[PDB]
Amino acid sequence: EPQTLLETTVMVSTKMPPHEPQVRPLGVYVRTGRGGPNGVTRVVLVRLTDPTDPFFLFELELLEDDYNAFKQHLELLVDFHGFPRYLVGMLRDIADGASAYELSFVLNSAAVGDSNRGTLRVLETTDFKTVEHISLVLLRQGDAGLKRYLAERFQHYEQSFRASEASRAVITAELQEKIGDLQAANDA
Amino acid sequence: EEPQTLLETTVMVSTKMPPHEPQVRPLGVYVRTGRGGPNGVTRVVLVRLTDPTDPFFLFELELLEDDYNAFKQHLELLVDFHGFPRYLVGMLRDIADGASAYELSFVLNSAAVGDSNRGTLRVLETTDFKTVEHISLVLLRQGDAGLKRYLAERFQHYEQSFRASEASRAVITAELQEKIGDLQAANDA
Amino acid sequence: DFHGFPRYLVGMLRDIADGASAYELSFVLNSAAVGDSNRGTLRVLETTDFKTVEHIS
């Protein structure tokens, strides 16, 4: 049953205090599926990546059971099913340029190697002030987890490359064979 | 004079995790000369062994030109540092291509890949009398940091190669569809 | 700036009192009775389908 609701790139204001923030394009991947202690809990996963840096991998994994606390702390007004649906709605809207909002990501230290987390925020600028719409703490991944990520994406695109070899090979042949039919129609 | 992949292919290898019974698997073999070492200006030979069915199966022997004389004496080799990878690869390519009578073997120092930190790679000749060993190389399993680079490297590679095949498909799918519409109208005439 | 803060604050609150605002006012004390409290948090809240969005505190 797992399902990716969003997988795209978006400019994000990343900040490693006390350094000055700087805008980078970042990957956003959001996927629902199954996990937890006994592997039968519904999960929502939020994943943040940097195409310019393979080790830049921050994730929030949310188990359905922990959600009531989550909904309360963040004052959400949707159930576990709508949360990732609205989150990607909000984020995709920003990435699409249809949003007045901007994306921000603040790490808990001045360097990436010493950080273990970041707070990703959806921010609105008004004349009065920046208004915060949502806040999520994302944890930086551990190596073993990370190896899987790379290895996962490694295996993924290797297949996808081969698949395009198959598509190129079949369609090259169909339409190349079509020249010969329509060559005889020209002869007519 | 400049770095070079001398070999990058797949070949059947007899893999053995003692005390378990050996088993034959297809393994990746990559052999590359280039620059490396303590000060990064030493000529190196790299031998890399992989398993397409297993991303963590990543074993390497890295050899520095400074270290080679010991290597040469110990293994009773009769070529210099420059010829060694050409002949190693000569031998391996002969095997992968099927032109060799020889076989490949890889024996781990433990019962699981997870518990190993090394393996011995051997080129073996079967005779009526006995197995005759032609060469043996110990390869070390990589530390996490090394491996993450390998995966990330291969990650970025095939992501691009995929993108390129979309471009190639786009070229051929679009032109040839454009040709169908032209000559389909020529049939209509 | 300091000059605008009360203008926008009052802008926001006055907007609410007149009924021209979509926003609501909230006040949460640090205890269960007024006699034991010494403070409260006053918030301007926006209701969305997704969540309450806080505008000022």
Side-chain angles (χ1 to χ4, degrees):
Chain A
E1 215 194 343
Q3 198 172 345
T4 307
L5 282 64
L6 180 63
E7 185 178 344
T8 197
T9 304
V10 56
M11 293 310 139
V12 176
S13 165
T14 80
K15 186 169 150 48
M16 309 189 180
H19 296 173
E20 286 310 314
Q22 67 150 23
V23 176
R24 294 192 259 169
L26 296 187
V28 180
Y29 169 86
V30 179
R31 169 183 62 86
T32 187
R34 290 280 165 172
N38 41 24
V40 208
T41 313
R42 291 195 115 88
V43 285
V44 178
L45 170 72
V46 184
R47 179 180 287 127
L48 195 66
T49 305
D50 179 356
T52 66
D53 183 11
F55 305 168
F56 192 107
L57 178 58
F58 293 47
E59 286 181 15
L60 165 64
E61 82 175 334
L62 181 73
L63 292 159
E64 188 169 16
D65 310 325
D66 298 346
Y67 185 66
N68 272 276
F70 191 69
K71 180 190 212 217
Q72 192 184 67
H73 180 326
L74 291 186
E75 304 183 355
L76 307 179
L77 295 172
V78 290
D79 64 23
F80 180 72
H81 186 23
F83 160 67
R85 182 177 175 197
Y86 279 170
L87 174 67
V88 297
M90 185 175 283
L91 297 173
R92 207 175 23 172
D93 259 15
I94 294 168
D96 290 354
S99 183
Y101 306 145
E102 286 178 296
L103 271 182
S104 165
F105 191 63
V106 175
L107 280 69
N108 73 332
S109 187
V112 171
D114 246 35
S115 78
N116 69 349
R117 79 184 58 110
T119 304
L120 183 163
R121 306 164 79 208
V122 174
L123 304 178
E124 186 192 349
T125 301
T126 73
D127 293 329
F128 189 12
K129 63 185 296 284
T130 298
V131 175
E132 176 185 23
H133 281 256
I134 197 163
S135 184
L136 301 177
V137 177
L138 276 52
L139 293 182
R140 194 159 153 264
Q141 297 305 115
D143 288 23
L146 164 69
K147 311 177 211 156
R148 275 189 254 96
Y149 171 74
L150 295 166
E152 179 253 291
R153 281 284 155 182
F154 166 40
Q155 304 179 329
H156 174 202
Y157 283 107
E158 178 177 1
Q159 276 177 8
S160 296
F161 170 65
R162 304 277 184 251
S164 267
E165 297 292 285
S167 287
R168 164 156 37 158
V170 293
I171 304 183
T172 37
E174 297 182 18
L175 301 197
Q176 258 275 356
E177 198 262 3
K178 218 163 261 204
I179 297 159
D181 288 340
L182 293 189
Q183 190 173 343
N186 191 319
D187 281 359
Chain B
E1 58 305 336
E2 38 184 358
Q4 252 173 345
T5 307
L6 282 176
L7 180 63
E8 185 177 344
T9 198
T10 33
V11 58
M12 294 311 293
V13 177
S14 164
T15 79
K16 186 169 150 337
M17 309 189 288
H20 296 172
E21 205 64 23
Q23 172 151 351
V24 178
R25 294 192 256 169
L27 296 187
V29 181
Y30 169 86
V31 178
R32 170 184 156 177
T33 187
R35 292 207 166 288
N39 42 261
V41 207
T42 314
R43 292 195 150 88
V44 286
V45 179
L46 169 72
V47 183
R48 179 179 287 127
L49 195 66
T50 55
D51 178 285
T53 66
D54 183 11
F56 305 163
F57 192 109
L58 178 59
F59 293 50
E60 286 181 15
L61 166 64
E62 192 175 348
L63 180 73
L64 292 158
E65 188 168 15
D66 310 325
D67 298 346
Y68 185 66
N69 273 72
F71 191 69
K72 181 191 212 217
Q73 194 184 358
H74 179 325
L75 292 186
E76 305 183 354
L77 307 179
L78 294 172
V79 291
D80 64 23
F81 181 73
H82 186 24
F84 160 67
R86 183 177 79 76
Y87 280 166
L88 175 67
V89 167
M91 186 174 283
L92 297 173
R93 206 176 279 275
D94 250 12
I95 293 168
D97 289 354
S100 183
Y102 306 145
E103 287 179 298
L104 271 182
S105 165
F106 192 64
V107 175
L108 280 68
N109 73 332
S110 186
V113 171
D115 302 312
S116 78
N117 69 349
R118 78 183 57 196
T120 305
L121 182 69
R122 306 164 79 208
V123 173
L124 304 178
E125 186 192 349
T126 301
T127 74
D128 293 329
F129 190 12
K130 63 185 296 284
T131 300
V132 174
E133 176 185 23
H134 281 256
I135 196 163
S136 65
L137 301 177
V138 176
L139 275 52
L140 293 182
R141 194 159 153 264
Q142 296 305 117
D144 289 20
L147 163 69
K148 309 179 298 202
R149 275 189 254 95
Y150 171 73
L151 294 166
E153 181 253 291
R154 276 281 157 265
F155 166 43
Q156 303 180 311
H157 173 202
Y158 282 108
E159 176 179 1
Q160 179 144 64
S161 296
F162 167 65
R163 301 275 183 250
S165 267
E166 298 293 285
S168 287
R169 164 155 38 158
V171 165
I172 306 182
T173 37
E175 296 184 19
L176 295 193
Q177 249 276 357
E178 199 260 4
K179 220 164 161 186
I180 298 158
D182 291 340
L183 292 190
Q184 252 273 343
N187 187 61
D188 283 359
Chain C
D1 64 23
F2 181 73
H3 186 240
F5 160 67
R7 180 177 175 279
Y8 280 166
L9 174 67
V10 168
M12 185 175 283
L13 297 172
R14 207 175 164 72
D15 250 13
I16 293 169
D18 290 354
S21 183
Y23 305 145
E24 287 178 298
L25 271 182
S26 165
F27 192 63
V28 175
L29 280 69
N30 73 332
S31 185
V34 170
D36 302 313
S37 78
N38 69 349
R39 78 184 57 196
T41 305
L42 182 69
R43 306 164 79 207
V44 173
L45 304 178
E46 186 191 349
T47 301
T48 73
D49 293 329
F50 190 12
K51 64 185 296 285
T52 299
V53 175
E54 176 185 23
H55 281 256
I56 198 163
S57 184

